[PDB]
UniProtKB/Swiss-Prot annotation, chain A:
Subunit relationships: Component of the MCM2-7 complex. The complex forms a toroidal hexameric ring with the proposed subunit order MCM2-MCM6-MCM4-MCM7-MCM3-MCM5; loaded onto DNA, forms a head-head double hexamer. Interacts with CSM1 and MCM10.
Note: Present with 166 molecules/cell in log phase SD medium.
Domain of life according to the entry: Eukaryota
Listed name of the protein: DNA replication licensing factor MCM7
Encoding gene, per UniProt annotation: MCM7
Binding site for ATP 1: 61
Lineage: Eukaryota, Fungi, Dikarya, Ascomycota, Saccharomycotina
Subcellular location: Cytoplasm; Nucleus
Disulfide bond entries: none
Described purpose of this protein according to its UniProt entry: Acts as a component of the MCM2-7 complex (MCM complex) which is the putative replicative helicase essential for 'once per cell cycle' DNA replication initiation and elongation in eukaryotic cells. Core component of CDC45-MCM-GINS (CMG) helicase, the molecular machine that unwinds template DNA during replication, and around which the replisome is built.
Sequence similarity: Belongs to the MCM family.
From Swiss-Prot, chain B:
Sequence positions that bind ATP: 384-391
Ranges spanned by the short sequence motif Arginine finger, renumbered to the chain: 516-519
Location (main, coarse): nucleus
Subcellular location field: Nucleus
Superkingdom of origin: Eukaryota
Protein name as annotated: DNA replication licensing factor MCM4
Enzyme class: hydrolase
Effect ascribed to mutating residue 390 to A: Loss of MCM2-7 complex helicase activity
Organism for this UniProt entry: Saccharomyces cerevisiae (strain ATCC 204508 / S288c) (Baker's yeast)
Entire protein: shown range: 177 to 838 of 933
Keyword tags: ATP-binding, Cell cycle, DNA replication, DNA-binding, Helicase, Hydrolase, Nucleotide-binding, Nucleus, Phosphoprotein
Domain MCM: 334-541
GO MF: ATP binding; ATP hydrolysis activity; DNA helicase activity; DNA replication origin binding; helicase activity; single-stranded DNA binding
Length: 222, 641
């Protein structure tokens, strides 16, 4: 047996594009993959519970191409929250013109096309060989979390839960924060501790996690 | 000095060492291996076995690892299992006769001398699937753990090469030499000298019994990019009708090799040798999960009894543990302690867990004289907001249940559910393969994303949910089989983020009857509020606070082992017959709840029978109806709308 694109990926990464155009079969498979790291098949000789252990990274576009500022994301987007709940993170990257930012946006694009060398900042991005060496080394640890951060995480979870449920049931509201949201926050704080290369978690990381979580959708209000 | 060519094994020295270890072993492992009353661990088996006339015996590896004078025997039985066991087959009888010397007995000696003996090393060193078996380590005692897919017929083998001389009214006898027969072409020169006049007859000869089993390997670790495989093996006589489809197995054997012919025409072989495995023992049960229904397997029980092969089929009990069980059943906090114990790593979900445990209890298994059958199984459905422990609970149930399969979404079809026909890769012949619906025959069937699954596939379950009997009519196959499996699956809500102010019987994207016929359903709506969220948050963060949740044992949580043994004994030993008092509450509860079909009556009775089975009651009583109706109404949350 040789598996499909997901199976050839394991303890690694996967990429997908135009998710809205995929079939309900793909939706059913990825739904099971995202939360549980197995796969079930009952077609033929194959009756396996195959191990995926894969990381999913999809992308798509709205129903109308450009955003609908007069409709909520929960309606403009085509995917259902019944599945999107498993998506611990979600960004809404839409564009509105502005006189100043596009100046240097065009500057950057023109420079990179003039020559592949990225802007000549006093900075040297490094080879993916070294990046993979670093990520492999950081993957060796398995840090721990204290109670001083646990209680703050619980308080923030309660805050977000109540605020989103009672207040965010309106124009710019997407569903509600979930236990999966809490688990993702915890996992990302663990990743931050791994990057710092310490076997303990500091209170200085949950702040970053929640900051990014609530900044993912800042543009929805402009 | 006595030794074997190219070997470091001694016959008489090994015999003496084996006898010394046998005479001297008293739970040495409880002392050396760990800190954990009794005496002479081994000797009891041999003392008791004599009167029952059995030519079998089991054997561990940890005992040799523990005793002082068996460490070297360890590697010698490892490298040369067949030779060491052939030595042991004589050493065991030597010890038997040297132990009878201290006893006077009635004249049973006519049997032991003519008898034989064999061993079965079962709990041995671990092996990492088949990837580890590079050709350096061939022909050695090995262990594995996998499930069963396909079983083949009986292969006879020439064991007594009879021969018929054409003249001189004489027969002839000759035996096999390392797996070949050399027919003596001559004709017993003395009486007659015809150098090539003899014949062959099959009815006279003796035959051996062999099987071949296709197995699916289920390791504990796999490399980056692994996928399932299939292996073939060979069992031999006295082990037939032991392992088949629908059983998880931990096994032992001996990796080997063999070439195959290039045709049925001449002797030209392949430079590559097809591998295989020859069995030494099969372990049919384990500690981390209960066992098969006892009434479901009565015919096989009696068949094995008659065949005098008694490999384990059901776990055995101890009187002290039975008394402990009766003591634990005395207290009244069982009804919530079981729920707290099923999943200590999750928030309460009290009624969900209680229903899961009642399903594991199962219920009632009655039959009529010829035209009835009513099995213990109540189909269960889940539904509610995502981002909860529904999938975790389902995976837990699949792990803990012995006989079940996992199916996901629309990746399934009627052909791959019921029986389907395929071809073998070696014999090149039309051979079948069992379907996932039948593989779980007795136990659990898990589904997720029950909504998007294809309508074609959703059609089949109508009859499974009723008579537990699938039917097949396709190429060369006409038979109706049995699928006593149970159903336990999740469902997703219509649209997304749910709709509070709408009838939920129409808020699922699923037709009425398919949902109504479910025996019981559970609802996982959100209802966000403190006093139910901060507690959960700490409950789940303290899981990670430790490297592994062993501090979770606080708050009165039982161990898995005693719980499972209690469940198995209760399942196998008690049969609560329906009572009279429960009628006047059951009928009224059903009628009042109709204000949505008669299947909920069957659901309620089958769940009240499981409740009566709990507490070890041999009789139903009125209270079970109360709990059943109250829990049904709470599960559907009648008070809301
Ligand atoms: Zn003759």
């Amino acid at each position: 047996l040789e598996g499909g694109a997901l199976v050839l990926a394991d303890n690694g990464i996967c990429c997908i594009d135009e998710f809205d155009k995929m079939d309900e079969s793909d939706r059913t498979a990825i739904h099971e993959v995202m939360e549980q790291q197995t796969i079930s098949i009952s077609k033929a000789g194959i009756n396996t519970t195959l191990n995926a252990r894969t990381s999913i990274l999809a992308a798509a576009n709205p129903l109308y191409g450009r955003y609908n500022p007069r409709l909520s994301p929960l309606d403009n987007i085509n995917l259902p929250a019944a599945l999107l709940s498993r998506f611990d993170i979600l960004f809404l990257m839409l564009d509105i013109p502005s006189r100043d930012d596009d100046e240097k946006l065009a500057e950057h694009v023109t420079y990179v096309h003039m020559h592949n060398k990225q802007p000549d900042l006093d900075f040297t991005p490094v080879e993916p060989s070294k990046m993979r060496e670093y990520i492999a080394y950081a993957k060796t640890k398995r840090p721990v979390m204290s109670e001083a951060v646990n209680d703050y995480v619980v308080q923030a979870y309660i805050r977000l839960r109540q605020d989103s449920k009672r207040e965010m049931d309106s124009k710019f509201s997407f569903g509600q924060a979930t236990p999966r949201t809490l688990l993702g926050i915890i996992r990302l704080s663990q990743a931050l501790a791994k990057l710092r290369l310490a076997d303990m978690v500091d209170i200085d990381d949950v702040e970053e996690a929640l900051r990014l979580v609530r900044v993912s959708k800042e543009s929805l209000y402009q | 000095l006595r030794i074997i060519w190219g070997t470091n094994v001694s016959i008489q020295e090994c015999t003496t060492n084996f006898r010394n270890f046998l005479m001297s072993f008293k739970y040495k492992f409880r002392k050396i291996l760990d800190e954990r009353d009794e005496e002479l661990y081994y000797i009891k088996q041999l003392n008791e076995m004599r009167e029952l006339g059995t030519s079998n015996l089991n054997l561990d590896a940890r005992n040799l690892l523990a005793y002082k004078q068996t460490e070297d025997l360890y590697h010698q039985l490892l490298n040369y299992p067949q030779e060491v066991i052939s030595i042991m087959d004589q050493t065991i009888k030597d010890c038997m006769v040297s132990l009878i010397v201290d006893n006077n007995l009635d004249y049973d000696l006519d049997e032991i001398e003519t008898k034989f003996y064999k061993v079965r090393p079962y709990n041995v060193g671990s092996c990492k699937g088949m990837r580890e078996l590079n050709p350096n380590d061939i022909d050695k005692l090995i262990n594995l753990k996998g499930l069963v897919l396909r079983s083949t017929p009986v292969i006879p083998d020439m064991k007594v090469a009879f021969f018929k001389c054409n003249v001189c009214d004489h027969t002839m006898a000759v035996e096999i030499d390392r797996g070949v027969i050399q027919e003596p072409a001559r004709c017993e020169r003395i009486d007659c000298n015809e150098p090539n006049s003899m014949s062959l007859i099959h009815n006279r000869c003796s035959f051996a019994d062999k099987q071949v089993i296709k197995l699916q390997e289920t390791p504990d670790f796999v490399p980056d990019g692994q996928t399932p495989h299939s292996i073939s093996l060979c069992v031999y006589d006295e082990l037939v009708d032991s392992c088949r489809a629908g059983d998880r197995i931990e096994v032992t054997g001996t990796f080997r090799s063999i070439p195959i012919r290039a045709n049925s025409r001449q002797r030209v072989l392949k430079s590559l040798y097809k591998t295989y495995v020859d069995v030494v023992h099969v372990k049919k049960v384990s500690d981390k999960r209960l066992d098969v229904d006892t009434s479901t397997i009565e015919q096989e029980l009696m068949q094995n009894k008659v065949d005098h092969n008694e490999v384990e089929e059901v776990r055995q009990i101890t009187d002290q543990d039975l008394a402990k069980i009766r003591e634990v059943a005395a207290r009244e906090d069982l009804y919530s302690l079981l729920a707290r114990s099923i999943a200590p790593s999750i928030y309460e979900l009290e009624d969900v867990k209680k229903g899961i445990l009642l399903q594991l209890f199962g219920g009632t298994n009655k039959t009529f004289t010829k035209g009835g059958r009513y099995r213990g199984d109540i189909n269960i459905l889940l539904c509610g907001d995502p981002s909860t422990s529904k999938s975790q609970i389902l995976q837990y149930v699949h792990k803990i249940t012995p006989r079940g399969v996992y199916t996901s979404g629309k990746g399934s079809s009627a052909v791959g559910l019921t029986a389907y026909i395929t071809r073998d890769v070696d014999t090149k012949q039309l051979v079948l393969e069992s379907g996932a619906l039948v593989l779980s025959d007795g136990g659990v069937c898990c589904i997720d994303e029950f909504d998007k699954m294809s309508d074609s596939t959703r059609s089949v379950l109508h009859e499974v949910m009723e008579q537990q009997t699938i039917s097949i009519a396709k190429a060369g196959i006409i038979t109706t089989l049995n699928a006593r499996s149970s159903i336990l699956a999740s469902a997703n809500p219509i649209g997304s983020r749910y709709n509070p102010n709408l009838p939920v019987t129409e808020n699922i994207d699923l037709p009425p009857p398919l949902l109504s016929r479910f025996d019981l359903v559970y609802l996982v709506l959100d209802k966000v509020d403190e006093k139910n969220d901060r507690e959960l948050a700490k409950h789940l963060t303290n899981l990670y606070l430790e490297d592994k949740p062993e501090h979770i044992s606080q708050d009165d949580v039982l161990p898995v082992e005693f719980l499972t043994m209690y469940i198995s004994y209760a399942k196998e030993h008690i049969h609560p017959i329906i009572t009279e008092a429960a009628k006047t509450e059951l009928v009224r509860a059903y009628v009042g709840m109709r204000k949505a079909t008669t299947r909920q009556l069957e659901s309620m009775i089958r769940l009240a029978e499981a409740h009566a089975k709990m507490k070890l009651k041999n009789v139903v009583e009125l209270e079970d109806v109360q709990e059943a109706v109250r829990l049904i109404r709470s599960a559907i949350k009648d008070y809301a709308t």
